[PDB]
């Protein structure tokens, strides 16, 4: 691609600059270029990749929701549908790009729990974003999200402590999948509660800084439980 001539280290440096400048499309392109060098990613690099694409797809999701809401009102000319479709297609292209990087070849080279769980969670997340706009096929997309989350959960429970921030963010997002995508609010509530309680019981093992990291994510579990019950 267009980043093939740039050094890996320069791509990472520029991704960090783009983050500081709130240029998330650039940040994603730089990190895509870094992935395509073929070397595994460090913990920091994995998070740069995630931050970049989360911001890109987050803007698209917010736009899609606005347009879909306008479209649904109009059904209570073709321009509203056309433009919602345009944004939707762009969003799906971003998700497909991320899923392609995970499949070629981030996941298969990831052996440590922290990397493998991170990437499988990401695969669940971007199939979930595809599911949010899918209509009927929606079933196979939902199953793909579920499968990725489940594999990630199984590894995280075996290999990580209950306060691990990757484990917590995985359980959080899988609970959102259950509530928002899979029409399983009881599963969502059960998962959030068990995750929160098992992390609570492990906090005593943590340093002050790790305690801060874990409790910040636990608060999101609690906020969802408040909304859901």
């Amino acid at each position: 691609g267009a980043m093939g001539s740039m050094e890996r280290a320069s791509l990472i440096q520029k991704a960090k600059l783009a983050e500081q400048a709130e240029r998330y499309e650039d940040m994603a392109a730089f990190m895509k270029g870094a992935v395509e060098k073929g070397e595994e990613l460090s913990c920091e690099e994995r998070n740069l990749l995630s931050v970049a694409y989360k911001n890109v797809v987050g803007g698209q999701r917010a736009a899609w929701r606005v347009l879909s809401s306008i479209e649904q009102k109009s059904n209570e000319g073709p321009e509203v549908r056309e433009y919602r479709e345009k944004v939707e297609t762009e969003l799906q292209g971003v998700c497909d790009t991320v899923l392609g990087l995970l499949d070629s070849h981030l996941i298969k080279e990831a052996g440590d729990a922290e990397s493998r769980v991170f990437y499988l969670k990401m695969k669940g997340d971007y199939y979930r974003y595809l599911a949010e706009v899918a209509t009927g096929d929606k079933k196979r997309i939902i199953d793909s999200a579920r499968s990725a989350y489940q594999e990630a959960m199984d590894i995280s429970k075996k290999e990580m402590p209950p306060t691990n921030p990757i484990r917590l963010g995985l359980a959080l997002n899988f609970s959102v999948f259950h509530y928002e995508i899979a029409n399983s609010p009881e599963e969502a509530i059960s998962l959030a509660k068990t995750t929160f309680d098992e992390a609570m019981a492990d906090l005593h093992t943590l340093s002050e800084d790790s305690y801060k990291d874990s409790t910040l994510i636990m608060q999101l579990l609690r906020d969802n439980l408040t909304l859901w019950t």
């Binding site: 963010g169 959080l172 609970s175």
Partner: peptide, 7 residues
Amino acid sequence: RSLSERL
């Protein structure tokens, strides 16, 4: 809408 993992 439910809260998902933040950056």
